Short mmCIF file of C-alpha atoms and ligand atoms in Angstrom, two decimals:
data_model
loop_
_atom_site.label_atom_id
_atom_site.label_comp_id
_atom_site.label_asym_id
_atom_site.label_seq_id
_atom_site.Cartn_x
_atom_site.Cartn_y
_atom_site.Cartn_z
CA UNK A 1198 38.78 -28.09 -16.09
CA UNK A 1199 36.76 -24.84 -16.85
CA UNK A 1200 34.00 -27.16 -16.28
CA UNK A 1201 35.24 -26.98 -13.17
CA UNK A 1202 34.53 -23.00 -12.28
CA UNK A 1203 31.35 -22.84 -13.70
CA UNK A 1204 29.96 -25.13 -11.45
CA UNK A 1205 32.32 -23.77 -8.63
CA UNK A 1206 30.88 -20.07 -9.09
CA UNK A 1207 26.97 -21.35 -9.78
CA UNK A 1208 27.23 -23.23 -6.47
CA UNK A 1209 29.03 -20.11 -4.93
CA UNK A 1210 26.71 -17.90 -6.33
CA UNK A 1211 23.57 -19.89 -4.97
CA UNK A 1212 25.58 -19.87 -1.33
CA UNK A 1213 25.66 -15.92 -1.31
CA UNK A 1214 22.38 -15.12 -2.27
CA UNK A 1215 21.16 -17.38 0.28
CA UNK A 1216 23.78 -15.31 2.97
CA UNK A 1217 22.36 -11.95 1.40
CA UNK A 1218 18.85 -13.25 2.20
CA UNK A 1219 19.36 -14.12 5.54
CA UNK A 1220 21.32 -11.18 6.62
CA UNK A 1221 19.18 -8.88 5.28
CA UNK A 1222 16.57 -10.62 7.76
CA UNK A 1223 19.04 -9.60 10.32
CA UNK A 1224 18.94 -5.69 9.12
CA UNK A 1225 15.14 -5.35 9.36
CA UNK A 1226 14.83 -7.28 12.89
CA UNK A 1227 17.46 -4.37 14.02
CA UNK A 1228 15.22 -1.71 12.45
CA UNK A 1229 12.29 -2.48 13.90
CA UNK A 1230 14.33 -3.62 17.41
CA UNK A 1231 16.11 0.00 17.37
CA UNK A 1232 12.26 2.00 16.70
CA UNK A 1233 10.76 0.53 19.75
CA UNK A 1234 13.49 0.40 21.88
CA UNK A 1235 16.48 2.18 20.68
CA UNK A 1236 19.80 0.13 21.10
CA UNK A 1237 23.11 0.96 22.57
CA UNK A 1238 26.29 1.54 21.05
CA UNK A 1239 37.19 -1.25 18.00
CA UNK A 1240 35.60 -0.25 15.31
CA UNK A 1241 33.27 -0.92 13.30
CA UNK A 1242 33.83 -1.65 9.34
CA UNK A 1243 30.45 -1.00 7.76
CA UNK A 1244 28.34 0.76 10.41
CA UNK A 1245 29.36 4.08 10.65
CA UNK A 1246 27.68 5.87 13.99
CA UNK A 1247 17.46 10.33 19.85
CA UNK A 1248 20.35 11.01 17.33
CA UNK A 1249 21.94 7.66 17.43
CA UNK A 1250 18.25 6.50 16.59
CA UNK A 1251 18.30 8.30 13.36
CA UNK A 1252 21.41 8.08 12.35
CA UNK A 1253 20.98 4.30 13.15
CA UNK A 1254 17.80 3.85 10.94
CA UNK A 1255 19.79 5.85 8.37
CA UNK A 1256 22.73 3.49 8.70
CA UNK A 1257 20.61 0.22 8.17
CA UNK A 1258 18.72 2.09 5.11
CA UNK A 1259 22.39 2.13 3.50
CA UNK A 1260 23.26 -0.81 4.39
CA UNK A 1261 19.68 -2.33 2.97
CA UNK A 1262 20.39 -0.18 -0.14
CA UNK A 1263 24.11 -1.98 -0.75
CA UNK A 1264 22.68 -5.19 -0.08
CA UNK A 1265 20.39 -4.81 -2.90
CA UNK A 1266 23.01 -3.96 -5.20
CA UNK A 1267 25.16 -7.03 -4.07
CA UNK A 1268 21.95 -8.89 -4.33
CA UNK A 1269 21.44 -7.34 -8.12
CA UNK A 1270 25.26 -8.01 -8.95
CA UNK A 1271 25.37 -11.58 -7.85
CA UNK A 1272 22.11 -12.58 -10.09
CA UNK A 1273 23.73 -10.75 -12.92
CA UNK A 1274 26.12 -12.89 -15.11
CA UNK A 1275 27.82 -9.83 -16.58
CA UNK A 1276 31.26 -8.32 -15.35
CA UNK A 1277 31.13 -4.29 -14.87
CA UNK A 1278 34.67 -2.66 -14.83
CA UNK A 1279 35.04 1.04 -12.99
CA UNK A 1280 38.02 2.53 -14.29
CA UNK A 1281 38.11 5.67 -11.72
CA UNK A 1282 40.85 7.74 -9.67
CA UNK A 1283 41.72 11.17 -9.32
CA UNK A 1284 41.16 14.00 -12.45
CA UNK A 1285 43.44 14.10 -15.09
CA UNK A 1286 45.36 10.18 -14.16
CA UNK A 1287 44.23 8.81 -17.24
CA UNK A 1288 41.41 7.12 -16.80
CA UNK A 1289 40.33 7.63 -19.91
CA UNK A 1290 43.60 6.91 -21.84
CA UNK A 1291 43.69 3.48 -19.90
CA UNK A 1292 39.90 1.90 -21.45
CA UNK A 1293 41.37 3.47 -24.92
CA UNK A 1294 44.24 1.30 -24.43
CA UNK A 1295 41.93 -1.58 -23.37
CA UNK A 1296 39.73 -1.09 -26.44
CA UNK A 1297 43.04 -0.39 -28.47
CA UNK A 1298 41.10 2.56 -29.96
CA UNK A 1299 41.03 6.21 -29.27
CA UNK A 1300 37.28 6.04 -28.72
CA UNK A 1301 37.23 7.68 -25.25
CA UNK A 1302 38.27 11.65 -25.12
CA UNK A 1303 41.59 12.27 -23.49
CA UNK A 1304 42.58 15.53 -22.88
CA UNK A 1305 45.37 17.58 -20.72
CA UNK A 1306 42.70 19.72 -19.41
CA UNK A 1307 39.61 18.41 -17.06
CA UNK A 1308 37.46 16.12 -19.47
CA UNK A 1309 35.26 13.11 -18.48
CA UNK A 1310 32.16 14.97 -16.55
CA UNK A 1311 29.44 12.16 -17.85
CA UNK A 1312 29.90 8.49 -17.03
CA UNK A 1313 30.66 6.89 -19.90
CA UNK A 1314 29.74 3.07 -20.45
CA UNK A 1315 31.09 1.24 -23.04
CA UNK A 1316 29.29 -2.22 -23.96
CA UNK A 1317 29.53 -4.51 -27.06
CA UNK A 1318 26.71 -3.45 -29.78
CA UNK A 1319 25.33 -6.87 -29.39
CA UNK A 1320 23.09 -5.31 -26.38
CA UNK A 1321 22.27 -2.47 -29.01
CA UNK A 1322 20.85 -4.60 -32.47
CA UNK A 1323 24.61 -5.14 -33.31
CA UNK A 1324 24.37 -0.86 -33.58
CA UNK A 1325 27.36 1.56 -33.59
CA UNK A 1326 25.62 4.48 -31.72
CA UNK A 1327 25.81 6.68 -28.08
CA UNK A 1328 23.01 6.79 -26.28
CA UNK A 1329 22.93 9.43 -24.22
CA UNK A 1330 20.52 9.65 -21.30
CA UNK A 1331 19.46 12.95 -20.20
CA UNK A 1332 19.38 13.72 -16.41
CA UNK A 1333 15.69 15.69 -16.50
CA UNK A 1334 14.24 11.87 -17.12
CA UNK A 1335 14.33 11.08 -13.20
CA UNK A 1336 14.82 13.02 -10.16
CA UNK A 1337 18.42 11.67 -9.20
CA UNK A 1338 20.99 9.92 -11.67
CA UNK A 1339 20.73 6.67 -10.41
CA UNK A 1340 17.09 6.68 -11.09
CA UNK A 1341 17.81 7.52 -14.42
CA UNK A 1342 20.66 5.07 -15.41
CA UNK A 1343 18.23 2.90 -13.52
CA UNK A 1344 14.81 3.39 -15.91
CA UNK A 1345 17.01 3.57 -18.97
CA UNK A 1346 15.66 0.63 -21.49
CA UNK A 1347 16.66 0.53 -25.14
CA UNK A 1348 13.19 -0.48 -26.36
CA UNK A 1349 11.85 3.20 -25.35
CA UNK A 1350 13.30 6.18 -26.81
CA UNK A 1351 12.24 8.87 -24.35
CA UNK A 1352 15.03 7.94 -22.27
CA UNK A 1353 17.45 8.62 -24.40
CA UNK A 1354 19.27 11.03 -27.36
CA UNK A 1355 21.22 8.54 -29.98
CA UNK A 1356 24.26 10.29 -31.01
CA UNK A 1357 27.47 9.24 -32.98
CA UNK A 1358 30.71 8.07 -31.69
CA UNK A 1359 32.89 10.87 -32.98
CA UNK A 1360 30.09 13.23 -31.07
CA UNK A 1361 31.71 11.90 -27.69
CA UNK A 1362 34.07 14.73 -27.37
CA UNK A 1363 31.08 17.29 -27.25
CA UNK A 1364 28.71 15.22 -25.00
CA UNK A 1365 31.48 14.06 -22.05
CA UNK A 1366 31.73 17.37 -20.59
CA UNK A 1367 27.64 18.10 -20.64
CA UNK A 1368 27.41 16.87 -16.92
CA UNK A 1369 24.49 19.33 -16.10
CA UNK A 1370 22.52 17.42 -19.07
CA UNK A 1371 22.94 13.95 -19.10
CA UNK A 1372 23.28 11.25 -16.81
CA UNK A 1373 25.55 8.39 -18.60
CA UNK A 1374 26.44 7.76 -21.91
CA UNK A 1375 26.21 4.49 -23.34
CA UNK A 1376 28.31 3.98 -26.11
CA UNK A 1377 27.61 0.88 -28.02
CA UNK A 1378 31.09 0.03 -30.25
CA UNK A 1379 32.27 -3.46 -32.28
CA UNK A 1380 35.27 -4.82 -32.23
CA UNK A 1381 39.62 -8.31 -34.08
CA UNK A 1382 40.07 -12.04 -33.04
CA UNK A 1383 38.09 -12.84 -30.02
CA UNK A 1384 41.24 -14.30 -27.82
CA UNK A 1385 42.72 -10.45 -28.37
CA UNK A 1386 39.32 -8.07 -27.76
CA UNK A 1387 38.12 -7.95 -24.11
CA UNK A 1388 34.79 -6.85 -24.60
CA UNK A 1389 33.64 -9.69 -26.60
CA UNK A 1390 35.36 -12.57 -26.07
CA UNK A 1391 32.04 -15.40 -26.25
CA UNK A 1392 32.19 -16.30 -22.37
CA UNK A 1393 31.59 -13.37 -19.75
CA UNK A 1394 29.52 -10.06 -20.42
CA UNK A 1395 31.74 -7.34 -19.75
CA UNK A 1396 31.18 -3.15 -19.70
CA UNK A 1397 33.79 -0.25 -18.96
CA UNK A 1398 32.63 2.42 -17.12
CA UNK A 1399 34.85 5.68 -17.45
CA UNK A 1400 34.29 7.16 -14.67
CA UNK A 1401 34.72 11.06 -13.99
CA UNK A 1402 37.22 12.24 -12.09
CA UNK A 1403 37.44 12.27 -8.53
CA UNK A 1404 38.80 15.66 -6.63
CA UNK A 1405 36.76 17.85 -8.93
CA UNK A 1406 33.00 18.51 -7.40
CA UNK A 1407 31.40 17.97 -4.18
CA UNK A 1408 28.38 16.66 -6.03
CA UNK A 1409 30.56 14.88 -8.78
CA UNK A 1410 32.57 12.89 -6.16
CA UNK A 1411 29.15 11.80 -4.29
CA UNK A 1412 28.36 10.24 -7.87
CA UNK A 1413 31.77 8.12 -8.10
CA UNK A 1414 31.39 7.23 -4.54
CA UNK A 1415 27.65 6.21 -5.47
CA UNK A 1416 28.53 4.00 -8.48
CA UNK A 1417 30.89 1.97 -6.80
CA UNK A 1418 28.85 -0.32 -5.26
CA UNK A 1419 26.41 -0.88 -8.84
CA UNK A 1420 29.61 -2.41 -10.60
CA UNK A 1421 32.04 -5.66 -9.71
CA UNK A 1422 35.64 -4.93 -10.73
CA UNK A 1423 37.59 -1.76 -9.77
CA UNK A 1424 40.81 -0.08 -11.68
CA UNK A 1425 42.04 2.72 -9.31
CA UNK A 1426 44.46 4.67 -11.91
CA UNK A 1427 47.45 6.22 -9.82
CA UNK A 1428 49.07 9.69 -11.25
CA UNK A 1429 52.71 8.48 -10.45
CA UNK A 1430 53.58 11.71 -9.49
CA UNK A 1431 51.37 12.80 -6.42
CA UNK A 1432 50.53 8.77 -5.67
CA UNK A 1433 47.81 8.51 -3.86
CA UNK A 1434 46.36 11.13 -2.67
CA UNK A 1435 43.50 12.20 0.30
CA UNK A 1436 40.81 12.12 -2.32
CA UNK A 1437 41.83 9.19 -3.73
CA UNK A 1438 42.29 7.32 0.29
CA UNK A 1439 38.52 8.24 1.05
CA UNK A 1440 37.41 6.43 -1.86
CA UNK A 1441 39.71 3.49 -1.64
CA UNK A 1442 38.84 3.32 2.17
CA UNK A 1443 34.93 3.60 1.74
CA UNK A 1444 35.14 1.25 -1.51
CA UNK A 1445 37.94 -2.01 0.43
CA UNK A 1446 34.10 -1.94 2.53
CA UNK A 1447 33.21 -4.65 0.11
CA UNK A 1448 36.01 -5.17 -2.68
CA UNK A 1449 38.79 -6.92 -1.01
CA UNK A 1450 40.69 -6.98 -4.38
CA UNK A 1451 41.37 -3.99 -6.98
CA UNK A 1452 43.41 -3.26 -9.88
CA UNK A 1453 46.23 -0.06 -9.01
CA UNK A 1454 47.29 1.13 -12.85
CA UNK A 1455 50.00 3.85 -12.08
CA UNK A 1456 50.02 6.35 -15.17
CA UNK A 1457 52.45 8.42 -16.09
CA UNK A 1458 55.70 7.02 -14.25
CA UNK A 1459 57.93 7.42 -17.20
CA UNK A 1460 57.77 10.97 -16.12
CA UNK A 1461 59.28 10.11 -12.95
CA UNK A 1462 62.81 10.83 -11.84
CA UNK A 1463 63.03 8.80 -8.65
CA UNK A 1464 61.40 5.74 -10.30
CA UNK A 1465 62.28 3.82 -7.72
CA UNK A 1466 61.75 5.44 -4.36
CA UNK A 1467 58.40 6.77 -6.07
CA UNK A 1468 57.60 2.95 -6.87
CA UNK A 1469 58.67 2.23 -2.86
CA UNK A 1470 56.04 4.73 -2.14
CA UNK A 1471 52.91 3.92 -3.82
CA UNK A 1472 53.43 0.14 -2.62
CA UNK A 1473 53.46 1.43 0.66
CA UNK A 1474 50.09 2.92 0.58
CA UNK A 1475 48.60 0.10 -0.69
CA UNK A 1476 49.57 -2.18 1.64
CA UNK A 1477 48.00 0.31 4.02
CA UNK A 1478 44.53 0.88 2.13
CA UNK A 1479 44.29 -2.25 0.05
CA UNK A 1480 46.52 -5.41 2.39
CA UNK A 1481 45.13 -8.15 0.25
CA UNK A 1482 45.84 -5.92 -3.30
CA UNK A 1483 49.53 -6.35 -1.29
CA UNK A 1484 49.47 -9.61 -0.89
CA UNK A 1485 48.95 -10.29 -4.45
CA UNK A 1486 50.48 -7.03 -5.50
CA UNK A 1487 52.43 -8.65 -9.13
CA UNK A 1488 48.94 -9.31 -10.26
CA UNK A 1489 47.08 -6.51 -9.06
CA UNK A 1490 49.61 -3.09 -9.41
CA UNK A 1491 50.62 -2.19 -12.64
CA UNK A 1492 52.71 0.48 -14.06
CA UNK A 1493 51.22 1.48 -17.66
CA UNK A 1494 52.43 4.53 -19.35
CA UNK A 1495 50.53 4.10 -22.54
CA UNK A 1496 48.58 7.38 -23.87
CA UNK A 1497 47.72 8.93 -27.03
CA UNK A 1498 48.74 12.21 -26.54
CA UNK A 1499 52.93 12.12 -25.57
CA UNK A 1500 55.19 10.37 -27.93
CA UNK A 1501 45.85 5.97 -33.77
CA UNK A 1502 48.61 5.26 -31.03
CA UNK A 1503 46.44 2.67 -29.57
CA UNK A 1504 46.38 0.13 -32.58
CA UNK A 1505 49.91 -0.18 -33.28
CA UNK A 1506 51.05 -3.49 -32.64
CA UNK A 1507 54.49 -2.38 -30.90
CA UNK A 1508 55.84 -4.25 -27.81
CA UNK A 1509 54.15 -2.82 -24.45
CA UNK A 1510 55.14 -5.52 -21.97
CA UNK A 1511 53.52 -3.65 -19.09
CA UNK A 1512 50.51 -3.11 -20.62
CA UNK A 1513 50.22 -6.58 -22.00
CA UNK A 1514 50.76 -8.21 -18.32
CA UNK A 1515 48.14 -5.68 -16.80
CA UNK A 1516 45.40 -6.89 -19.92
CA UNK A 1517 46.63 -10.49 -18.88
CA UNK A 1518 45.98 -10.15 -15.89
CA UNK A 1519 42.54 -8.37 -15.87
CA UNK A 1520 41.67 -11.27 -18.50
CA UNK A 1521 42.59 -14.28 -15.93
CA UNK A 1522 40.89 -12.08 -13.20
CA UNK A 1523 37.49 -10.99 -14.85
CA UNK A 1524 37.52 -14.66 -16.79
CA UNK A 1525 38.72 -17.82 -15.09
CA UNK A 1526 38.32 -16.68 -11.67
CA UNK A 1527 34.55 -15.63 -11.30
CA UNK A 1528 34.40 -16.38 -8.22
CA UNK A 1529 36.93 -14.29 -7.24
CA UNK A 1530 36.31 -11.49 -9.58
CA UNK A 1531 32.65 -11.70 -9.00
CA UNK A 1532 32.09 -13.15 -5.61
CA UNK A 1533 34.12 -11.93 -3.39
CA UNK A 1534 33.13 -8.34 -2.83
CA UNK A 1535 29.75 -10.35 -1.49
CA UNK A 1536 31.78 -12.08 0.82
CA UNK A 1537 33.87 -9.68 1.97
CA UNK A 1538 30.83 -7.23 2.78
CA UNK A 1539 28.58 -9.59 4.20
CA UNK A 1540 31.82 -11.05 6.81
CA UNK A 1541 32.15 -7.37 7.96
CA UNK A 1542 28.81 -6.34 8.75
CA UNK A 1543 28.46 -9.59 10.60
CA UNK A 1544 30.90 -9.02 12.59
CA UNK A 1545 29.09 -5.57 13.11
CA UNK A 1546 26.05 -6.91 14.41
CA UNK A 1547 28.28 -9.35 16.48
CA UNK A 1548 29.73 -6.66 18.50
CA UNK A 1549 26.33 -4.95 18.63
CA UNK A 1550 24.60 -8.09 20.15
CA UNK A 1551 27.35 -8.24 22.30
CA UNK A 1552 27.63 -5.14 24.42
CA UNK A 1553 23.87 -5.53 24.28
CA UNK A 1554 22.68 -8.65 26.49
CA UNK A 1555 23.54 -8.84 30.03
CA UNK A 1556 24.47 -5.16 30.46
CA UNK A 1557 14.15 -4.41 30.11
CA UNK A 1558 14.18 -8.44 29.61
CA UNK A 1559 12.87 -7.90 26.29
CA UNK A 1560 15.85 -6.49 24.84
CA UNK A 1561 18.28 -9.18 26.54
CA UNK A 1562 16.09 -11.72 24.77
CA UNK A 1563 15.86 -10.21 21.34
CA UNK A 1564 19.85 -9.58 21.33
CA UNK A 1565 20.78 -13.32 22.77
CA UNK A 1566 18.82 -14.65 19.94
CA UNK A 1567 20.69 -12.32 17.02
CA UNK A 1568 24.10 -12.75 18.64
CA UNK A 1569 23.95 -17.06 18.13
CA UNK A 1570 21.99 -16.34 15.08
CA UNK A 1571 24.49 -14.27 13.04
CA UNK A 1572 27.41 -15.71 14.89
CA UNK A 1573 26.26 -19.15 13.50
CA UNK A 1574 25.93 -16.91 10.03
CA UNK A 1575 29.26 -15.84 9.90
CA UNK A 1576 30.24 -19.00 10.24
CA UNK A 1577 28.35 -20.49 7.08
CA UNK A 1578 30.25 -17.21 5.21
CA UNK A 1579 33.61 -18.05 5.92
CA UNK A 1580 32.96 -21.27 4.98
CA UNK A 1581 32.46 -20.17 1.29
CA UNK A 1582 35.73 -21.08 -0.16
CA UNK A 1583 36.16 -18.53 -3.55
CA UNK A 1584 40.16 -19.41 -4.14
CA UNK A 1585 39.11 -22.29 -6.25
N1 GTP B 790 53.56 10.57 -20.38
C1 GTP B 790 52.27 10.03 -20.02
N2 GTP B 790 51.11 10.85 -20.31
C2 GTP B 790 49.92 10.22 -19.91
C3 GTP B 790 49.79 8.96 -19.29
N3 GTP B 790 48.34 8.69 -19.04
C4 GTP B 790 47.74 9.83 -19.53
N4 GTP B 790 48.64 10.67 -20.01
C5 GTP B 790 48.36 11.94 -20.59
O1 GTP B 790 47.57 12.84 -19.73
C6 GTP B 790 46.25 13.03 -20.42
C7 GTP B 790 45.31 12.32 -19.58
O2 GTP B 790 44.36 11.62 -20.32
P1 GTP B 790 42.86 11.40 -19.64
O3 GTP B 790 42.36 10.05 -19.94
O4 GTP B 790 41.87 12.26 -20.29
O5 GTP B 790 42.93 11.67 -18.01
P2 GTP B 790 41.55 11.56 -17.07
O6 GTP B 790 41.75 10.70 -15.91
O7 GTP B 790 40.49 10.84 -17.80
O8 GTP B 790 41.03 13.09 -16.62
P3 GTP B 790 39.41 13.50 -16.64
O9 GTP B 790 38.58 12.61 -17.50
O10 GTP B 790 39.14 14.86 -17.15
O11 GTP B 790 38.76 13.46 -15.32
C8 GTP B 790 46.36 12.50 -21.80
O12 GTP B 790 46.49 13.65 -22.67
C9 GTP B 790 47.57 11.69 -21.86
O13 GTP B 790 48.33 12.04 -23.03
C10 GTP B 790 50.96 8.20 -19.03
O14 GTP B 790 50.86 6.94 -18.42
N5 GTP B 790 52.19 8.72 -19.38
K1 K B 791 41.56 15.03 -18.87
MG1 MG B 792 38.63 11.34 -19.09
#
C-alpha cells in the first residue's frame, strides 16, 4: 500500500499550502490593521510580545519569514536532517555512523564551526568534491547558502574530502560546506536509497558563540527533521532547553540520540532523568518515546570503526527508525511541523481577535471578521489527518 502514502502526503501537501496561503493573508491584514490603529494585547506559543507597535510589526515580519520557509519546505520533495545539540555531544560522530564512514571530523576538542551538508554526488555530476562557500559572497549567511548554485563557480572554492578537517573550523571564512560523497546496497545506505532526497546537516555546536548559536537557532526552521544529540552526562542542559523550546514552535516530533552513556555510572537514574526532560520540552517525543529516544554510544575515537559490520543493536534500531520516519511516513516526517506551526499561531490570532472586539467601530469590525475567519481556519487544520 505505499501507493497509499504517496497519494496521502500529495493530497496533504496540497491541503497545507493552501492553509499557509490563507494564513499568511491573515498576517498582512494584522500588519496593516496594527500601523493604522495599533492593537491591544495564557500565553502565547508563537507570538512573542508605541513599543508594542514595533515589536508587533517585528513579530509578524518573523512570523512572515517562517512561513516562507514552511512554504519552501512543503514544495520541496527532499528530506533535510539537522543533527545539532550542545558542543562536543557528538554530533559529528553520529552522521559518521549514519554514513558508516569517518567522513565528518570528530575531535575531543571544539571542532564543527562551518555547517557542514552532506548530499549524494548525484546533485554534483555524480562528483566526489566539497564545495565550500565563502561568507564575503553575501552580506549574512543565509543569503549566501541561499545564492549558492553549482552551475556558477564564484560562489564557491571546490576542495577535497580529506581537506574537511582544515576547512570545519574556518567559521570566519565560509558559510557551509557542501560535501558531495557516494555511497553499498541501496536498502543499507540512507542517503541514496531511490525514493526520498535526503541531506545531513552537521550542525555546529550549540553553547559556544553568541553569534554561532543565533546561526543554529536560524537554520532550524530551513530543514524538516531534527536529531537533538544528548551528552549523557550533563543531559540536557539550559542551552540545549532554549533551542528545544524555540524549535517544539513548529516540530512536534524529534529524534533525542543520547551519546556517550556507556560512560555513565548511574545508567539508570541518569536514563530516569533525561526522559523526564523530555516529557517536559518535547510531550509528543514522550508519547512515542521507543521510537524517538535513542541511546547510541558509537564513536571513532574510544575503543575505520564505522564500517565494521559488528552487532550495534542500538544503533541499528535508531537507523530503523529514522528510515520508517524520514521514508514511509512523509506525512509525518514532512508535514507535520506545517501543521503544528500553523495550529499555534492560529490559536494566536484567536486570542488576539478575542480580547479585541467588544472591549473606534472600525476596529470591532475588522477583529469580528478575523476572529470567525481564522477560527473557521483552524478548524480546516485540525482536520488534516497526518497519522495515516
Ligand atoms: N565513549 C563515547 N565517546 C563518544 C561518544 N560520542 C562521541 N564520543 C567521543 O567524543 C568526541 C566527540 O565527537 P564529535 O562528533 O566531534 O562531537 P561534536 O558534537 O561534533 O563537537 P563539535 O563539532 O566541536 O561542536 C569523539 O572523539 C568521540 O570519540 C559516545 O557515544 N561514547
Ligand atoms: K568536537
Ligand atoms: Mg563536530
Amino acid at each position: 500500500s505505499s501507493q497509499l502514502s504517496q497519494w496521502n502526503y500529495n493530497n496533504n501537501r496540497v491541503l497545507l499550502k493552501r492553509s499557509i496561503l490563507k494564513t499568511q493573508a491573515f498576517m498582512d491584514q494584522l500588519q496593516e490593521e496594527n500601523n493604522i490603529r495599533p492593537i491591544f494585547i495564557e500565553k502565547l506559543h508563537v507570538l512573542q510580545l508605541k513599543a508594542l507597535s514595533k515589536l508587533f510589526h517585528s513579530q509578524i515580519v518573523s512570523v512572515t519569514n517562517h512561513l516562507n520557509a514552511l512554504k519552501k519546505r512543503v514544495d520541496d520533495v527532499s528530506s533535510k536532517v539537522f543533527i545539532t545539540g550542545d558542543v562536543n555531544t557528538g554530533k559529528s560522530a553520529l552522521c559518521n555512523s549514519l554514513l558508516k564512514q569517518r567522513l565528518l571530523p570528530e575531535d575531543q576538542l571544539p571542532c564543527t564551526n562551518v555547517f557542514s551538508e552532506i548530499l549524494e554526488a548525484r546533485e554534483n555530476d555524480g562528483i566526489e568534491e566539497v564545495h565550500a562557500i565563502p561568507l564575503n559572497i553575501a552580506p549574512t549567511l543565509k543569503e549566501a547558502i541561499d545564492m549558492y548554485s553549482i552551475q556558477n563557480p564564484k560562489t564557491y572554492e571546490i576542495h577535497t574530502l580529506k581537506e574537511l578537517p582544515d576547512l570545519v573550523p574556518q567559521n570566519g571564512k565560509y558559510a557551509l560546506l557542501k560535501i558531495y560523497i557516494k555511497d553499498r546496497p541501496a536498502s543499507t545506505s540512507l542517503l541514496r536509497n531511490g525514493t526520498v532526497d535526503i541531506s545531513l546537516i552537521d550542525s555546529p555546536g550549540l553553547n559556544m558563540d553568541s553569534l554561532q548559536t543565533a546561526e543554529v537557532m536560524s537554520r532550524q526552521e530551513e530543514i524538516d527533521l531534527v536529531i537533538f544529540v544528548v551528552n549523557a552526562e550533563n543531559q540536557l542542559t539550559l542551552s540545549a532547553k532554549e533551542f528545544i523550546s524555540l524549535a517544539s514552535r513548529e516540530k512536534k516530533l524529534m529524534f533525542f540520540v543520547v551519546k556517550k552513556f556507556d560512560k555513565i555510572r548511574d545508567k539508570q537514574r541518569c536514563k530516569e532523568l533525561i526522559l523526564k526532560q523530555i516529557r517536559d520540552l518535547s510531550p509528543e517525543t514522550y508519547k512515542r518515546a521507543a521510537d524517538f529516544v535513542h541511546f547510541v554510544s558509537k564513536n571513532g575515537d574510544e575503543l575505520d570503526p564505522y564500517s565494521s559490520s559488528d552487532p550495534d543493536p542500538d544503533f541499528d534500531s535508531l537507523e530503523d527508525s529514522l528510515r520508517n520516519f524520514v521514508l514511509k511516513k512523509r506525512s509525518l516526517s514532512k508535514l507535520l511541523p506545517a501543521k503544528t506551526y500553523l495550529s499555534k499561531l492560529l490559536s494566536d490570532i484567536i486570542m488576539i481577535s478575542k480580547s479585541n472586539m467588544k472591549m473606534n467601530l472600525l476596529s470591532i469590525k475588522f477583529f469580528q471578521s478575523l476572529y470567525e475567519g481564522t477560527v473557521a481556519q483552524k478548524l480546516m487544520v485540525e482536520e488534516i489527518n497526518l497519522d495515516i
